[PDB]
Amino acid sequence: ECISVKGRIYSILKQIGSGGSSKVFQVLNEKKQIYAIKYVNLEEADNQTLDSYRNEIAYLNKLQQHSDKIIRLYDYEITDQYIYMVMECGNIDLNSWLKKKKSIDPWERKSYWKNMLEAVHTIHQHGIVHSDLKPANFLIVDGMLKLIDFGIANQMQPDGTVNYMPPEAIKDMISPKSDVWSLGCILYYMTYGKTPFQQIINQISKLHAIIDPNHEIEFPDIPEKDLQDVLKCCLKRDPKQRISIPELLAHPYVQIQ
């Protein structure tokens, strides 16, 4: 403690997560209000790294107005030495919140989906495919879920999963559909209290089972029938037959009643 951004001044409560060359702190301002300041040290970074940071602020900045399911950015500061991002602070990141709760209320799981849908929808409209969606990328604030990063800059962890990795990702060694899958696996996890491949732990065989057509996934018949359809359409292995976000936003699960 403590941090100084564009004239304003903040004291550091906790360290939420770490990069990267980056650190996220939960942060208190003068008026006892809570915030999230991400700090990037730019001393040990090449032009490829630097430019991905500049691209991140640009897009976070740009997308402010287009959806209230993108983490708010209040102000920022960039020099040749450092970057600070003053953002809204979340209650709990979806990952840890899914770990804590045993069963999820349906009306609450549908609301988080609409929310996950709107966010991802928004980035796609500005030509961004996350490519690496995980519940760690989402956050709860004032009822809603909110996307926090864009897969543009290097991912951070709390202070290395592949459950959600799409089949076409690993098969190629650029498609909106890749996000649809990962959103599916998240919805799956919220539905069947597990990711679809949680059973396996050996990577070389897990990454192999994601892509394996012979490896059939379970969809235990559940009350909400719309929901069972979304998961199926979402977790098709073939990108071109997998449901799209616009389709997914027109689906009876999100639309009926």
Ligand SMILES: O=C(NC1CC1)c1ccc(-c2cnc3c(NCC4CCOCC4)cc(NC4CCCCC4)nn23)cc1
């Ligand atoms: O870097 C971020 N976005 C990129 C620039 C476009 C970013 C990172 C974290 C937050 C944020 C705000 N509040 C919380 C937040 N709030 C929960 C706290 C609250 C007090 O108890 C501990 C958790 C958690 C949390 N979890 C971690 C961050 C590091 C990587 C994995 C996920 N992130 N977070 C917002 C933006």
